[PDB]
Amino acid sequence: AKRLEREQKLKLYQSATQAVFQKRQAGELDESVLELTSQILGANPDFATLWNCRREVLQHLETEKSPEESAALVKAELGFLESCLRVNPKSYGTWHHRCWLLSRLPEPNWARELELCARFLEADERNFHCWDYRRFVAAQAAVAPAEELAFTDSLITRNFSNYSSWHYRSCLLPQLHRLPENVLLKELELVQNAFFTDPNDQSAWFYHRWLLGAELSVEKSTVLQSELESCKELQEENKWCLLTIILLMRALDPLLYEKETLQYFSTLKAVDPMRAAYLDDLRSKFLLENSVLKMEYA
Amino acid sequence: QKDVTIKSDAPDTLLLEKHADYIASYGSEYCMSEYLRMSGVYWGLTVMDLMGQLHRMNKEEILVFIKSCQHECGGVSASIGHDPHLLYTLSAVQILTLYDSIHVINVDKVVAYVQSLQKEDGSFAGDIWGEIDTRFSFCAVATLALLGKLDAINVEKAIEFVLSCMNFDGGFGCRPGSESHAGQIYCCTGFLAITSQLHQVNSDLLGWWLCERQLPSGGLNGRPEKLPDVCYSWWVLASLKIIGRLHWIDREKLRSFILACQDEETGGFADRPGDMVDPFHTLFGIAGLSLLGEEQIKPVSPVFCMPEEVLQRVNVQPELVS
Numbered sequence: 162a163k164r165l166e167r168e169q170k171l172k173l174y175q176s177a178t179q180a181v182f183q184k185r186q187a188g189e190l191d192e193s194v195l196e197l198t199s200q201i202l203g204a205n206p207d208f209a210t211l212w213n214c215r216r217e218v219l220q221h222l223e224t225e226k227s228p229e230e231s232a233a234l235v236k237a238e239l240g241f242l243e244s245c246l247r248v249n250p251k252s253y254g255t256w257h258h259r260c261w262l263l264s265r266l267p268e269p270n271w272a273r274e275l276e277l278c279a280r281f282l283e284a285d286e287r288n289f290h291c292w293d294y295r296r297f298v299a300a301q302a303a304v305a306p307a308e309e310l311a312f313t314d315s316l317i318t319r320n321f322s323n324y325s326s327w328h329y330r331s332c333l334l335p336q337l338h339r340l341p342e343n344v345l346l347k348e349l350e351l352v353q354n355a356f357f358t359d360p361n362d363q364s365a366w367f368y369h370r371w372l373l374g375a376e377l378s379v380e381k382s383t384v385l386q387s388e389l390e391s392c393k394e395l396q397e398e399n400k401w402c403l404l405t406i407i408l409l410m411r412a413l414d415p416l417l418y419e420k421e422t423l424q425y426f427s428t429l430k431a432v433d434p435m436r437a438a439y440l441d442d443l444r445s446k447f448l449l450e451n452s453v454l455k456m457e458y459a
Numbered sequence: 460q461k462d463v464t465i466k467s468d469a470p471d472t473l474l475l476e477k478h479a480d481y482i483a484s485y486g487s488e489y490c491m492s493e494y495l496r497m498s499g500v501y502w503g504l505t506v507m508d509l510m511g512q513l514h515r516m517n518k519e520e521i522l523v524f525i526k527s528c529q530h531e532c533g534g535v536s537a538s539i540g541h542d543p544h545l546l547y548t549l550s551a552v553q554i555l556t557l558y559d560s561i562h563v564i565n566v567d568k569v570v571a572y573v574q575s576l577q578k579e580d581g582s583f584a585g586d587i588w589g590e591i592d593t594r595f596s597f598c599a600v601a602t603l604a605l606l607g608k609l610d611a612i613n614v615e616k617a618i619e620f621v622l623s624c625m626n627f628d629g630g631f632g633c634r635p636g637s638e639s640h641a642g643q644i645y646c647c648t649g650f651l652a653i654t655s656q657l658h659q660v661n662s663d664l665l666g667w668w669l670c671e672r673q674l675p676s677g678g679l680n681g682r683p684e685k686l687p688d689v690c691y692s693w694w695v696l697a698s699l700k701i702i703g704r705l706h707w708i709d710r711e712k713l714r715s716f717i718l719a720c721q722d723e724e725t726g727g728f729a730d731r732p733g734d735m736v737d738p739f740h741t742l743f744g745i746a747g748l749s750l751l752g753e754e755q756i757k758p759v760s761p762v763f764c765m766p767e768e769v770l771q772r773v774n775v776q777p778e779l780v781s
């Protein structure tokens with residue numbers, strides 16, 4: 162039953178491909194190839210050579226046709242692309258074919274492209290092809306860091322398809338300005354907030370470790386000591402919070418907190434046994450760091 | 460916490476003879492996938508050779524297919540009548556190295572093709588249509604390393620482009636600004652191995668990001684809060700071995716995941732247990748096991764995803780972290 166109708170399809174794809182190649186060596190760069198590849202690419206967007214062919218036709222027709230007949234072909238092509246992306250929203254060549262197409266338009270509608278990224282991110286908020294194409298579009302349309310950072314601020318808070326959006330933030334932020342103390346402590350806030358909502362959403366934690374890695378100051382040491390307690394209240398079996406406390410104590414006074422650093426490593430191993438070997442090496446590295454530090458005493 | 464649960468009745472045994480037959484007899488999906496054919500051929504040969512079974516494939520036939528796929532520019536297509544691309548260029552060169560048949564194609568023109576794809580910023584396009592990806596940075600230098608011709612490209616600008624795809628979390632994406640992804644981290648770490656720039660990786664940080672790919676089922680994902688997939692057994696492991704932190708994942712849980720992904724009836728591995736197998740997931744399941752020290756599988760270069768012994772023969776073995 163189902164084999165019939167899908168041997169039907171293979172037959173037709175298989176003959177269409179043949180005819181496309183025949184046409185190609187002969188050099189029939191025409192509408193007939195656009196029509197044949199349409200058949201094929203619609204069912205198989207990863208057939209890269211066919212996006213190549215389309216491109217060559219459109220460029221060949223692009224001259225020996227009226228700028229009205231060209232324009233019709235561009236519109237026809239954008240809708241074919243979108244229809245292909247709804248089929249395979251991960252196709253590298255489908256997305257890059259749209260990149261080529263938009264890049265060569267004399268007057269491209271980027272707002273419509275950004276809306277398309279919206280739609281695709283609604284379907285799959287982690288689709289990295291779409292985030293890339295979004296950054297392509299934001300750069301072609303010179304969208305400014307703060308506009309994008311609002312878009313990101315609306316796709317983390319409302320909903321938690323977070324990591325791809327917090328990454329984008331990570332890149333957009335430095336573009337507003339070893340990142341400023343004032344901004345750092347402001348992000349320590351947004352992130353310390355983040356992990357009292359879902360302390361088991363990991364984006365905030367990954368992000369916060371960057372923020373620590375990247376003067377103590379009464380201002381900062383107090384925010385870190387504060388963080389450390391906020392974290393201890395939260396410990397009332399969350400591995401991310403436990404690692405962070407070790408790293409905060411490390412951040413604060415590693416010689417002073419050596420005892421507690423060791424306690425924490427123990428609890429953390431029991432909570433996150435898969436990371437036993439990492440945590441051992443991290444503990445060894447801290448212990449050595451400390452022995453170096455104790456040799457600062459005379 | 461989106462993860463697979465592994466079931467009682469998931470295979471817990473390495474089924475090499477099935478994987479050999481599955482690969483030996485593949486294409487008898489195959490038709491929609493002619494566009495990747497050269498790479499499928501690489502995937503099949505590499506997994507067969509790692510499993511000791513390379514003789515069961517058709518050397519002479521393949522040597523002729525490759526030659527027919529070298530275009531006059533020097534690039535190699537996925538298949539006959541298809542257009543050349545960096546991907547299938549790497550794959551072909553790997554196959555010929557597998558077979559010690561470099562002379563089959565024009566080496567000088569491959570080198571020139573790859574040389575032609577580098578951009579001002581050091582990045583590589585995959586072809587003349589210009590898609591930039593860190594994949595292509597890896598494919599470029601991997602190809603040239605195997606031909607002894609790494610000095611054909613602008614290494615410094617290459618390195619710089621790659622390092623510019625390094626992210627807050629210590630990982631790498633496709634392009635500058637892109638989200639870290641185990642796949643692109645493999646490419647970038649592989650690339651820095653080839654170019655002797657591993658001291659620029661923050662190894663403890665990236666190694667931590669990588670080991671956090673491992674989920675309670677033992678399986679690995681490509682980035683935070685995504686589903687696991689056996690092919691990441693390759694992307695993540697290869698990356699960790701390269702930066703000397705392979706031991707940061709739980710090897711037994713991972714191994715249990717990888718075996719759980721086999722199809723006991725037909726052979727092959729799938730992305731996750733009980734799904735339809737394919738050759739790609741079959742290579743990366745086997746290459747992942749080899750990275751963890753499975754005895755029936757030849758050791759695999761974590762950089763080149765080819766048997767160590769092949770690379771020993773050509774004397775291209777990038778020094779790794781530790």
Ligand SMILES: COc1ccc(S(=O)(=O)N2Cc3cc(C#N)ccc3N(Cc3cncn3C)C[C@H]2Cc2ccccc2)cc1
Nearest residue numbers: 207251253492495498499546642688690730737738739740
């Ligand atoms: C059947 O649907 C597909 C989808 C995509 C592709 S693909 O674009 O050509 N390619 C190769 C690939 C080959 C096979 C096989 N046989 C199977 C999958 C697969 N994927 C898709 C995939 C794998 N794990 C999860 N995902 C979603 C990766 C992709 C990109 C890639 C190419 C070369 C080296 C590494 C990665 C092929 C088939």
Ligand SMILES: CC(C)=CCC/C(C)=C/CC/C(C)=C/CC/C(C)=C/COP(=O)(O)OP(=O)(O)O
Nearest residue numbers: 251594597642643646681685686688690763764
């Ligand atoms: C010599 C070898 C082995 C490779 C050559 C180098 C190349 C082309 C590498 C490709 C690396 C890469 C990008 C791998 C990722 C493959 C994969 C599992 C893609 C799917 O990722 P997502 O789109 O995020 O989907 P998931 O999160 O559902 O896995």
Ligand SMILES: [Ca+2]
Nearest residue numbers: 514515516517
């Ligand atoms: Ca044979």
Ligand SMILES: [Zn+2]
Nearest residue numbers: 688689690730
């Ligand atoms: Zn996969």
